[PDB]
Amino acid sequence: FLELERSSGKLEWSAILQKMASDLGFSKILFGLLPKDSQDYENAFIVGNYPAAWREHYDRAGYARVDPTVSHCTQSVLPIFWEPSIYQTRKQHEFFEEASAAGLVYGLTMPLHGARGELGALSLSVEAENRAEANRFMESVLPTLWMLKDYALQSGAGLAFEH
Amino acid sequence: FLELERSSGKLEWSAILQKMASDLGFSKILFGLLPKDSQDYENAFIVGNYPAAWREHYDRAGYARVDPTVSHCTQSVLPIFWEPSIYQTRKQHEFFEEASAAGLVYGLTMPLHGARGELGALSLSVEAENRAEANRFMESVLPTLWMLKDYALQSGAGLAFEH
Ligand SMILES: CCCCCCCCCC(=O)CC(=O)N[C@H]1CCOC1=O
Numbered sequence A, B: 001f002l003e004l005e006r007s008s009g010k011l012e013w014s015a016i017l018q019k020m021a022s023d024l025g026f027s028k029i030l031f032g033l034l035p036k037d038s039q040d041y042e043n044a045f046i047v048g049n050y051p052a053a054w055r056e057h058y059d060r061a062g063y064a065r066v067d068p069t070v071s072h073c074t075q076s077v078l079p080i081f082w083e084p085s086i087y088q089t090r091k092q093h094e095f096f097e098e099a100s101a102a103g104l105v106y107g108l109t110m111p112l113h114g115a116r117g118e119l120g121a122l123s124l125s126v127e128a129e130n131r132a133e134a135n136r137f138m139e140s141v142l143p144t145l146w147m148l149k150d151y152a153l154q155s156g157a158g159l160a161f162e163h
């Protein structure tokens, strides 16, 4: 958090957050944030290293309104693990297949709810060999991730919306 | 949390939360919560085992508007540890003397910000023979309490405000 706060500009903050994620064992991350009373998902503040073509398609196709992790974030402060049980409807299943082709198979999303009403998500994806190991690994680092998401929120909200 | 969610009503929920905090080494706790855009601190939803005479005095004297932990919660998602340095104004020093006489010297407050705009605090106080010891006790459980505060928020917001 101290490095994140000493950092200047989005490239540096993004680089620090991405390295924190990678050092913890997660090769892909997304931090997304909106100001209070905005549902403008396609124009959120977005940081991270999701493949660019996936990000562009996701926004163009309005996947924020289909992706079950986003609806979850609007309702909860608790993590959502990317298990098959969350990809229930045909459209969510098709979304899962496309996300999988983009390299996003195993992971979790931590909802973000800031002190000024900011709404966001911190997602991390892990390239584990199988689902069981992905889950054992994520559980083992979950307390660290839980702290990380609040530090990223407090710092990122300042970068996204403060002058 | 499943424990928190399976419970019936406020007395049971309070007992579960208090036991979880006690297991982490905290003998005094306060969980306070307000619905979106209400700062009526004297009418918050309050759970825990602060001395009743302190709670009554605190509300009567309007200490929510003096206590630096409360203003911190309105501004941040990060913990505030209790220590002389957070008490900066003359009024805050007077508050600190009274809080200390009530036994509330070593501890911390975790701000709560829920998905529906709920604003709250989970405060946790530890008994210790000195500050160095209090710090060892708190640091050793910080990642676990960081999860706990969000489970308590998600369950407590429903209990407090929803039919
Ligand atoms: C809660 C609203 C935040 C602002 C909008 C963020 C949009 C992007 C969110 C996102 O990509 C969630 C996520 O990581 N989804 C995973 C699930 C599997 O494939 C993904 O892309």
Ligand SMILES: CCCCCCCCCC(=O)CC(=O)N[C@H]1CCOC1=O
Residues within 6 Å of the ligand: B030, B032, B033, B034, B041, B042, B044, B064, B067, B069, B070, B073, B074, B082, B099, B104, B105, B109, B119, B120, B121, B123, B124
């Ligand atoms: C953020 C608003 C929550 C709703 C109002 C809660 C009122 C009580 C808050 C409180 O007691 C904070 C706290 O634990 N203060 C400590 C600090 C030392 O002595 C205290 O009483």
